[PDB]
Symmetry: C5
Subunit: 376 residues, 5 copies
């Protein structure tokens, strides 16, 4: 993830222009290789046409160049890129939305599972650990970074996500499919035992806990679905053919023909097809948007920071259910205890953001005494 | 936020034309700087071409101008702007939808947490204060205006959003990540204590309270997500390249060539490229839509009024849970107590809006006696 | 609202052609003023060019006309209109979806709040009245028609939406923001008192009531949001500039030049630029779609019938919770009491709509005896 | 509804080509009338131009034809059709999604409402009958086919959807608005009586029943909304003007001019403007998509089969709550009772669909011994 | 399903270029037949024009070719394909989202339905078997692969999805509609009996079980809806006409005319219309996206693996509710038991993915001492 939110807070003079000076996650970094190949092919064709070809061969090449330049179209490529890239971007955001966060669940485990004794601590930590374990099992299935960190279940044991007993239980349960679903079943059974054992005081609280846990299960299922059900290969191939064909055609149609022939549109021979290069940056960059986002769990600069998410989730969840269980700041009368209309102050830097309330769009409508009179 | 809802209530003669006379949040305010730079560059090129260049240099420049004007295309730029700006606008509205409002929660805290004594008052105020504190922690993380108002946690203490005890508790819990999640865990634990202490009469009410609070947590998580996971930089760079390249090409391709040469389309030499300037306003304004909305928590005219939202939420939430707790208007027979079909009157100004009921699209279908007879 | 659903039930010969004979909510009614202005400007330019201008001035004007006609483009305008109008239409439907209906809530108030005595009647009527009052407070904030009907809270008292005691309570609670949220807090507190007083038999029923009421609160909050957070002014100005600039350019570029000059495309001098007028109807009508829908709570023909909704909601809600409370039709064996497979008859007019069940797309697949045999 | 799902299961050679041989719900059936009118007008213009017009009149007509053919544009029409038709298709699917199915509710009524005696049977049947009655009241309000089947409430009585007592109760409750909402209030009151009478054992079950019933109410409200709030007439008129104007222009611009004049593009005089006819099929068919779908409750081939849905819902709901109440198949050990990893067999025809599990996209990543070592 | 997620994890040099070397689910496999037919027709026309036609016939053909090449347009086809294919892709993903997974339900059945005795085992297995049976009944109705595996209910009995007693019960209940809904009613009745029999301890747990089961019912209803309510045939025919007409026109308009005539754009006679073939691959591949996805339950390479889903669901669900019922790994202090801030290690391969926390976009804003001072 490359965050530039702070740089685009305001629509300042050349706000997006300044973003062209970025390297990480940039268009430049994504297509410089393809652009260099295109550059080399274009100038190989230029040298061949200018030097190797005979006069008749040069005339045939100049006819082919006019034909190819005539057969370059930007509407179909722009359209298919628009729709395809929009699909990729939509799926990208949906995949972020299906990253499981334990925060809702950990609030409920901290609140509902009772006991400051070692047994209550162990129960709360085990429940939230099952949640984190389910999350990491799916993430190591879909994220290259997470997999490289946990290339085997034994790595999960060494890293403390899974106990040796949990590892042994998983091996006993082995089916020939991804076992990421197991910790949810464990969570449901352990929550039930907690309720039957009196650690959860009422089955409505158990219902809430299982509802939050199942929300996480649905998110994990969606991550599995996106990882398994790729955008149909035929669609990806169609967009790829459109782009690569446009520029293969440009390799001949955008050659600078010999000025001596004075062909329409070839009066001057600049060596650099600057406009063609700008079209390359635009169209191939547009395609690189999809190439980066199609699998957002890879190692691209703008792929999701899955390892950070795993670490943060573990730290926060264990703190929430263990140290923060019935550990509250003292409850005392607040600063506005007997102030009907509290008005927190503004800083010198923030004074300009104090606003009057918007009362509704009708607030300023003017009506005469007669207009406002009720009729029988 | 620039509200013009009242000005566009009706589709009146030149309804949108009148909006062109607005300055705050206007296209003019957003691109006048870029337009002045473009204006200066265009006329520098004009003066250089007209005065400095020799006859041969002028002919070469006139060839380059014809080439550049030939290589100006509006379909790719319009397409990429359409899709990109639509993405930005969608994310903009989603970010508004993830601004947390305490209204649902405060109704439940006012209703369910019992006691007119000082302890009940303190409990209700503390719960709703935890909600407001969570909200402000995330908002100061994502909103420049809120941050400038609360540039440190100590500012939150001075402003009355957090007690000194709450501040000390937060410092004790410090992890190397944003601690905006803490007040939710506090809320869950305090609600649990209220239930165990008899201030909440039934665990179903506790379940409802925690459900509303967790809804707010999800909204805050979404604000964090949008602040962290920018639109991929490559996409922003692609759109920026498209626009800036179009107009860099225009800087040469839209020059008024010497009329004496009588080039096709250069018969008359107007000094102002009015059409090019209109295209600038259109395309760069379209891009400025995204530039303003990409981070709606900045200080642009049309960015969200986060400080007002924080102040209003605090005032309303404290009033709802403290002064309005079991404080109801007298319950008395309404004006339509024994009126089967109440017909509230209309004013002279509103009489034209009295309507007959729409009974359904089938209501006026005509059928003969034979057509309506049931068959065996 | 102009309903034409019945007229377009079937795809009949010239189904949409017949809709061009409509006046109310029509394109004609929305742009005739702008079209007349455009008509007058076009013919003023025609008369000036034909009569006032000298021969040299006429030649300069004919050059400018060719230039302007060359610089007319329909792709950018069509694109920006497509995206902008789609945004407006989406927001329009979302605003309809956020109009609160009390039907779900009134079913629960009728069912759950017990007692045929005067106290039960008063309690049910007061609860549903709080719902209707919240609805009308927001609607009078966002709807010009509702505001003109209720230009002050005292009008709400005279119309029977609010009691004098409720009015006094509201004035006591006054904060410098829209108080539309107050009746929800009152509802929560009154429902709690009903439960504690035994009128609501179980807290799960209280939970359901408050859930439905909070759904209405969220809808009202969305109405407030749409009324406050306009589509960014810059976007509206961009689309407006695109359209108005297209047609300002047409005012010169679409002039009929003197036939004697035999300019390419000006061989014949028709006086009416019929195609330009059709383009005006199309593009300015497309923009008028947005101009009407951008604020659907105004007084346009196709704005929502908010006053009718308020009246109907009041009548239905009071009937549902008061007259229909435990007032059921006699429960008796239905016509199909001992008929395993009930087959309600068809009329002569409806006989053609009797269908066989669709059993699924696989139902007709043919397989040989060998194909259907299970393998080991 | 024309179902062709089975015909397009696979992407076979000319899969969509074979669909052009369909008549019911076809493009041919929808526009043959308009196409015949267009055909007649085109050839009337041809005959007039070829025979009636004088030489000078023919030259004027040939100039007008060149002008009109120059002023034919396909981008605006394609754009506006794309956006408008997409809106219609979206609303079409949303309307299908708002067709109420009693299946969830009928499972809960079958399970929760106890008693195999006549009273329990009557209670279950009455509750599910109220659901079906609400559904049919709205459907007869919005569906021409349903209305023609039930053109009066008395028809609902004769068809067995409503008892005479229910009819009398409805007439007593009459307000000047659609009464489709009444059966929900009856359902809520009858469910409450069932709970108070001990037929529903616990208020949580009552809560579930009312939640499912209210889901159906929301769906019915959406059907009402779509029936009432048409797509704004101005938008429909805009698209209609675009299409009809394109083809009115084609009526002159696509005439075959006299070959003797050798106009550019009129060298050969084919009598049939085949390309213009293909454009007619395309554009007018695209518009006919909207014309059919704009009201999907009419009698078009591809309108919804509302009568079938009503009949099926009645049959299934009554069977589910009456015959299937506590009528279960014997519970016995399944075929895989002591089989840890059940492997149901495949047929000869299905053997090729047996697959290995997809274990996740990371499953095949290769790492060296050093790469997989944890670091301190 | 063709999964290529692992191949597109990163935006590597020619990432999408490498996907053009795929056969299964490829563009090549989907249109080679149509392309061969197009190839044969094009060269038959070439041979006829070059050999059979006389000089006058050749001149007429050359005029028709110029006319046809003039009448080839790519904007309407690209537009209609964009919108239509987007609709198909949206419906495709929605259909995947409506594939029922028993995981949420099986967690609740494993947790809530008590007893390690044979009766508890039978009850849990029967409940989850009803869920799987409902799923398979709908899937065999909509999926050709599933149907070919289970071409009759007796096949479901032989495969162990349904007992002989369940089969007999289904035959007794037979109505003239798809009976896929029956197992939900059985589930509701059996869950109710379990609660009344004490196997489910509290009606809130029963409520949760039925809520999850009804979610599955809604998904199955959606699968039925998509299978029944095809995309309107007229829309499919419109897109098909656009594509097939474009290429039928190309069959004449893209012929290589005799070079001796030196027609504009026919200077050189290449035999292969390479650009036309690329346009074929692009446009017909784009259409093949829809042709494959329109029914994603067929046997295409990229259709869903329904049989695998059925097998996996059965195996996992039975394991979860039977072997894993109250079978938990030992609960023991985790590796971070007394570690406030757990820091799981990284591998050598994963060290580069360790990140600092993103604290929010405001974290780096700089303010002076005066700017941060609160004002009165
Ligand atoms: C060929 C592909 C397009 C590439 C674009 C090349 C232009 C330069 C982009 C790099 C901007 C450097 C930003 C910077 O480091 O400086 C910061 C300065 C404050 O902010 C500014 O630069 C304010 C100036 C903003 C740009 C000028 C206004 C735009 C006018 C229309 C375009 C024609 C003008 C030549
Ligand atoms: C003018 C508007 C367009 C109308 C289209 C006219 C073409 C004929 C459409 C009717 C298809 C008849 C299908 C059929 O009953 O037969 C079934 C046969 C197996 O399936 C097949 O027909 C396989 C052949 C599929 C078509 C040929 C491949 C497409 C190649 C590009 C188009 C140019 C080829 C002329
Ligand atoms: C006519 C329809 C378009 C068809 C496209 C034909 C081009 C060849 C596609 C097949 C790629 C083979 C991939 C491969 O097996 O090799 C793997 C190699 C590492 O990865 C690479 O091939 C890296 C090279 C990536 C392509 C060259 C850079 C793109 C530059 C713009 C296009 C113009 C260049 C000719
Ligand atoms: Ca990636
Ligand atoms: Ca901003
Ligand atoms: Ca309006
Ligand atoms: Ca229809
Ligand atoms: Ca398929």
């Amino acid at each position: 993830t490359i965050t530039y939110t702070s740089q685009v807070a305001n629509a300042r003079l050349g706000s997006f222009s300044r973003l062209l000076l970025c390297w990480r996650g940039s268009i430049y970094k994504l297509l410089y290789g393809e652009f260099l190949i295109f550059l080399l092919c274009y100038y190989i064709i230029r040298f061949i046409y200018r030097l190797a070809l005979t006069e008749e061969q040069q005339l045939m090449f100049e006819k082919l160049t006019l034909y190819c330049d005539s057969y370059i179209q930007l509407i179909p490529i722009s359209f298919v890129l628009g729709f395809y890239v929009t699909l990729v971007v939509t799926r990208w955001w949906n995949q972020y939305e299906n990253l499981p966060w334990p925060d809702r669940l950990m609030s409920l485990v901290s609140g509902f599972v009772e006991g400051k004794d070692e047994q209550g601590r162990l129960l709360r930590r085990t429940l939230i650990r099952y949640a984190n374990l389910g999350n990491v099992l799916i993430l190591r299935s879909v994220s290259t970074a997470v997999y490289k960190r946990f290339p085997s279940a034994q790595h999960l044991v060494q890293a403390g996500f899974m106990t040796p007993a949990e590892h042994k239980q998983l091996e006993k349960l082995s089916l020939p499919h991804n076992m990421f679903w197991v910790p949810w079943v464990w969570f449901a059974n352990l929550s039930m035992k907690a309720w039957l054992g009196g650690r959860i005081r009422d089955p409505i609280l158990l219902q809430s806990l299982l509802n939050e846990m199942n929300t996480l299960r649905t998110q994990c299922g969606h991550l599995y679905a996106y990882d398994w059900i790729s955008i149909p290969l035929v669609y990806t191939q169609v967009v790829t053919v459109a782009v690569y064909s446009f520029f293969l055609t440009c390799l001949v149609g955008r050659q600078f023909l010999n000025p001596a022939k004075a062909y329409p549109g070839h009066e001057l021979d600049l060596v650099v097809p600057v406009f063609t290069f700008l079209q390359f940056f635009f169209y191939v960059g547009w395609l690189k948007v999809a190439e980066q986002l199609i699998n957002p769990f890879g190692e691209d600069d703008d792929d999701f920071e899955t390892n950070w998410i795993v670490d943060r989730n573990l730290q926060v969840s264990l703190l929430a259910v263990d140290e923060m269980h019935q550990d509250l700041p003292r409850m005392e009368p607040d600063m506005y205890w007997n102030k009907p209309e509290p008005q927190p102050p503004y800083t010198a830097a923030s004074a300009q953001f104090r606003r009057a309330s918007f009362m509704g769009s009708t607030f300023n409508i003017s009506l005469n005494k007669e207009e406002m009179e009720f009729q029988p």
